[PDB]
Design a protein around this nucleic acid. Sequence first.
DNA 1: AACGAAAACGTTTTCGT
DNA 2: AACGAAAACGTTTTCGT
Lengths: 339, 339
Amino acid sequence: ATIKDVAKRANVSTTTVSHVINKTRFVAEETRNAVWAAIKELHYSPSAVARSLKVNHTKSIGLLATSSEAAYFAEIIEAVEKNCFQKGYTLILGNAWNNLEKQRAYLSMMAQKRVDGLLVMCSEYPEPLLAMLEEYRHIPMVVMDRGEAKADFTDAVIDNAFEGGYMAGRYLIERGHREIGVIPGPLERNTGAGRLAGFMKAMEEAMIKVPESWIVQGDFEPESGYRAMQQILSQPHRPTAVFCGGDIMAMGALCAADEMGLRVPQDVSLIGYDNVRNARYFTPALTTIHQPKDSLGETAFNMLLDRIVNKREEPQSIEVHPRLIERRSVADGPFRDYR
Amino acid sequence: ATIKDVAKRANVSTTTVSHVINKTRFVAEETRNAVWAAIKELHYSPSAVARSLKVNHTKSIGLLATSSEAAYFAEIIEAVEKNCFQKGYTLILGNAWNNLEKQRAYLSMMAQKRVDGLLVMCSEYPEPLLAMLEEYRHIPMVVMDRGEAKADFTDAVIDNAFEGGYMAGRYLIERGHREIGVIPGPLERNTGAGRLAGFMKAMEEAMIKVPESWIVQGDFEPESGYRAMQQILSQPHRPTAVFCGGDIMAMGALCAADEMGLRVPQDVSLIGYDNVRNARYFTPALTTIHQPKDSLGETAFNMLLDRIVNKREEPQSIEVHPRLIERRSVADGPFRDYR
DNA sequence: AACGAAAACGTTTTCGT
DNA sequence: AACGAAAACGTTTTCGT
Ligand code: HPA
Ligand code: HPA
């Protein structure tokens, strides 16, 4: 149970056991053996809390999430966790559900648990969270889902959501569309307002006016896609193409369409965003803007592990790049030939 | 940084600080105050590794998963994590991907981290994993995804996958079907062979022979649904209804159908399984057997927290119940009127 | 009454022999 | 050369004053 019971059992010191265990200093084979053997019978497991107490690090990462069911997220997390395992780190997942208090509760639980660093995916960053985040300015952390830098006490990865919004609108335009609608995720999120403006840029360049009857708020969830679609597709005057700010919501956009009779992309075209793992299987296969999610995760881990190991101190920010992925949900629009 | 710097700062003992911090014994207000105040300026955070070292428990749960992207799973995990937070527990997620070694690596990392208990979702349990699981027979754990009890050193929750398979076939039968096909998940999994046999029971009762050209192995992933469907729907002689052992795979079953021209449920009917969170949004809305997933998670946590707290020792097993959920992907079959 | 002294948890590492 | 003695990490708790 203890390094003692083991040392004793092996007729050696604990200092010796600790040396064989951690291969920290030369040790006679027979000794080594003897130690292992005792470790076996004893059925010993080194307490990492004991060693952590001494060594000052826990070899563990704290993930202050929002939620982990949402495909998007689920995908990043599984990414993060993989780089944790690759590099010995243990992962502690905290879905704060956009709840300040819960955020408070996790950040603390984390700090007490003394995580080597913090990976931040809160979606929304109002001042009180920004505020709270700074107390923990001491523990090394990277905020993986924001716009710019409202930080200076942090590491960040930027997703270029604007340039994705815009990639989306452009394609719709390059396909013949001009009566386009949009359902954005929450405007308090980067992946919300960010994508939206990207897209909106595109329209103004195209001089395409976007009627408010055609912009309906989503929340990244299926029911919001459904409701939003249904709302745009039920205008007396409806668009020819829709930009849905998140695939999952998009999926719920397809559901409405079909249920309302309209064919996609024959009746309406739909371009989504994220390129979730199973969008290729949406019906019809979803055309969307893809987010390098695996790389969003690893670039975060790796960006954090650095501050930790190399004890780096100057705030960093690495960009990642969204790319269009043409599937089967967008059809040429009316202006395709006039260009 | 330390209880010392704090105690000092407050002009009190550490024993006193520890008492105010943990509300463990009466303490003069002014003292209390003084302590907090020092805790504030000091910007103090109690090390839970220190306290864990002393108190003998980490107030943390180890989740030996398989994967966490898969909706099914993703859903349970988010469940587990919620009950962890409800009850103070910290969660450590370990996706072992059905990799023994990785399993070895996580189980150890976990034990060393000294988790208060283990939540087990490995999907597949070959002997070498069963074997490995027993060494850890000392730490309190519940295996949440298996058939019966190949355990005796554990707590378990059973999902009645058989009775779900069978619920599925029955409905298909009660709808007029007799040329039915099936795509099961991996036969080394409960949710695989279990559901399958449930369903197969149903057929034998109905005297419905199920042609092997109609049973195609899935792996719970979209591409397997797709491929499996495509394979069944391309028989010179095809079925009228299909039972797809997992919703995600089902989703890929719809994709093939559509892409092959066939309408669902007009051309083929499809009943899935799991009732993932967004199946209501599949197109068309997926008819499926639902797994109480949130309750599968909580019943697991709660079942574990017991062995921990109440230090219970006699192996338990609590059943959970799958229920049919009629959506819009199944249509009456040819025998509907003759019954 | 209200609080402290110091032993203790399970290890790592620095002197040493 | 090969290994041990004992200080130390940051707390909790049991005697005590
Ligand atoms: O906040 C989000 N939630 C879910 N999916 C998403 N894709 C981009 N942003 C999000
Ligand atoms: O192993 C599984 N994986 C994914 N979804 C599932 N639904 C039941 N079993 C499974």
